[PDB]
């Protein structure tokens, strides 16, 4: 289908079936839900290749071949009305970018841009003209897509628009009315005092302000960027206040500057880490080596709220993405390590799962429902974390939408405008913590992908791989130690370049002259205002010395990370933006003019305090209360938000959400090791309790600090001063009583609580318009969020191994409760109250500062002395939930008595006061109690009872049964939410299977069977000779699992070398000098055009390199391992590998969702050399993949594979049998297949990640007697011995 397009040719190539069986059954059942009689529906992908030059015969074949991918589903001949859905015209989907890279990397330079769409074929002869428009709607997201009626209509996507000129606003010729008009038109949202500034400014200059200059100024001065509320003066109840919000927060740093390396001086904070071995490839040798040096820790937590309300997936994706840029741009370069996610929404109201407290209060048309946010949002954030390569180890998810009697009387409080939170931690070198000086004449560079028109405008666009490439460049720079060319690096986020650049030069006491036409752009038609102010993603601005340019270029190219020099640093503090096309100057301004601050903001507010009504307990019984509480999304299991995101990448994850043999998501905090050779590390926890604000502001804030602390309490940290905090404030500024409450809240923690505990707040952010106004019926309605503080705690871990979890032990034990509520048992603004549609009287609060510090100090002591068996703090759901979740984690029973907890049983069980339950060895009870008394906690400590093998959850009181149920029953109820979420989001069959497996109490959980000695380093004799064979650690743009892959081969005695595909395509390296090659995991090219396919075809199409691989595979004694993406890549290299004729393809999972699981596999009999002596073994392994399902060409191909004896690994359930049941088998591979070898066994490919779990500490769960090495370390040692 080759049709012209003015200057280029627009080729139309037909793709494979786009929708799976269950997906189609869903669409049809959804059509009838609107009375649309549709006989049958058939979707099919269609590719559109806008190419410049002609495509030769052999090249046309290679193109078609690039475009044949994905699951081999049922293919039908088109029939019915056609509806082509494609990205909206003038927009370039991320798919287009990655797919076009591949085309280029395959030598198809003629391809100007590849783009995809989905051709729907609907048979429904009954539908009217109007009913059709209704159908087209169900088939596309109006925010980013459009529907066509012809495959020809796709030409409208590659149109060449003429470069738009800069527009001037005639102030000199029309007066102030010119700025008034533009402010409205361009939508600048400038306050009267700002228009005055602009008027005087340009009057003094004597010229007209360009639109680009006005927008740039407007963006720099918005609330989001200026934070006027946080720096404003205050008058509360007719009384002037001495400090601003910011100043009060800075107070925590003044009283406690301990361990802080940087704060409020970067877009991230830095704290002291631990001296450990930083592992990376040397610049000169290309070999990975351990560098003994301090690995300081940086942190940051951001919010991408508003965007998420309009378009969830991209809104969440870019929220995490922009935050990753802030970490990477810390100082002169830093490396992101682990992530965290936060979500706050209104009631889910899941169809057919309506909860007792849920009421429909309507919502604005312009935004999406609570459910859609939780359906697409998490996938969006996880998408960026997965494709980029940083584990998502902790987070929170809370629902709240209720008409309640609060500070401003009866109102609708909730989250129609959601809280989308993303943050993380990272490592940074000591000498890079401080930003260097910007020398005059320094080249100003933009690192990242070509800009597009973004910022309806709230619909973002993420290209995670692009950022992965950029990060690799930043990594090469800081690894150059002193030679690090990066002088000053800054991230590009809000305000696009118009903000980022003026900020970079300004922070360096310089100015900058730029060239608009030096900026990389994907769409020519942009105006100077659009090229300079657009908010496209994956961009960094940095400064590099003139003489270091050749090096920076050498680095960017090797990583395929696009960059561009767009300006020069100048002496005079003056911003200049020249345009070469029109030969004019869009920007010409003195920096103090553009950055000139308007008068200080001053808020005169008054206090509002909610009356608060007693809890009406008419329909409240302890039994129904338990059932209700476990069904509140805030309390319920979060598996739908956890398994969708990677949790093992980097091989440094010690403690993830999933806990124990039964992998229950109840881990209170996250923990990572500082490196691949140390037991030190970092920790992350989250404290949040927003509902409490609807009654008391300071209390809610205090509780956030408290919970964060109690959630991290069971980790070996030491001095509390090591725990650094991040404070994120979500509020509805202007709303009655929120301003006085926010000040009171910020003060409560900034001036009082945090300084008293010795806790610093080096980072923070704000989002001040957390409200939503609309008209559902005939009148005005409003959904106001409560003041919402989200505290993120961070700390250097002393010993990663001593971290405690909620996994109970059935051995002789003692369940002790640390009740920090001091008997208060408050029920106000709790989960119990929410579950019965109420707010209640009085909420919880930090009752005694000294005891909270004492609590933490005591916990630190018990953790160091190894006197604790388990720990779980009390938060949402109360003591009931803490105990329930512990039982869930230990897969056992609980026998507790609550008579000493006060006469009010409901209160003792459902109050959300700080504290928790510790489990100690029975013989250790008295000593632990005495210790707990030493910190003055005796009155708060109460012996609850003990953990017992079984299925009974029994709560008594002096001699009466207060509550008793099947532990499995509570567990299954507690799961219903994630079950329902997975049913509507994933393959119903999978979600169901996973849910039903939890009802089977006989589940033994993950267990081990070892056919060999886990501690016998069989490679030691070899390593001892000093002779170290080199292994080619092969990566491609997008690979993110290469470092831990090299560290694994390193421990086995190899000298791992960093071999990038560019290195091969450039002749810098040759496989001839290697006896071993390993293809690493990740998301090469963002898995576009089939996971692993672009990477593989990149080799196959370049005959020189192709032969390099074939020659390697055809040698007599060479080894080759392929993990994950590598497994997928190599499976497409069958023609190059001898004895791989029977290998299968790896495609989309049956669940149709990314699976990051700790799955149990068994080592089967095969010629495989890397699995020597492991046959028969059964151990769990890291699984992070979305296209790992084995697929054969027909049953004959599968029988043939089985009879040839090529299967190396199979998934097995916890009972030991090979299973195709989910999630024990995460992808749905036939006969549990996830590893296959060749006839000679010299080549082995597999989906699981053995290299991520070679260290016992990197295993989510493992037997208590394992030493340093896990069973999987054997794979690597086997490779060394085999080489000799
Ligand atoms: N949005 C989220 N994303 C990822 N993990 C999450 C999210 N919300 C909760 N989790 C994880 O689920 C587990 C339980 O969450 P939650 O019940 O909120 O914990 P807690 O009770 O300690 O506050 C934790 O391990 C937590 O990190
Ligand atoms: Mg909880
Ligand atoms: Mg907790
Ligand atoms: Mg929490």
Swiss-Prot record:
Binding annotation for ATP: 315-326, 394-396, 667, 875
The UniProt record lists the keyword Oxidoreductase: no
Binding site for Mg(2+): 668, 707, 711, 873
InterPro entries the UniProt entry points to: Class_I_gatase-like (IPR029062), FGAR-AT_N (IPR040707), FGAR-AT_PurM_N-like (IPR055181), PurL_large (IPR010073), PurL_linker (IPR041609), PurM-like_C_dom (IPR010918), PurM-like_C_sf (IPR036676), PurM-like_N_sf (IPR036921)
Role description: Phosphoribosylformylglycinamidine synthase involved in the purines biosynthetic pathway. Catalyzes the ATP-dependent conversion of formylglycinamide ribonucleotide (FGAR) and glutamine to yield formylglycinamidine ribonucleotide (FGAM) and glutamate.
Family indicated by similarity: In the N-terminal section; belongs to the FGAMS family.
UniProt-recorded name of the protein: Phosphoribosylformylglycinamidine synthase
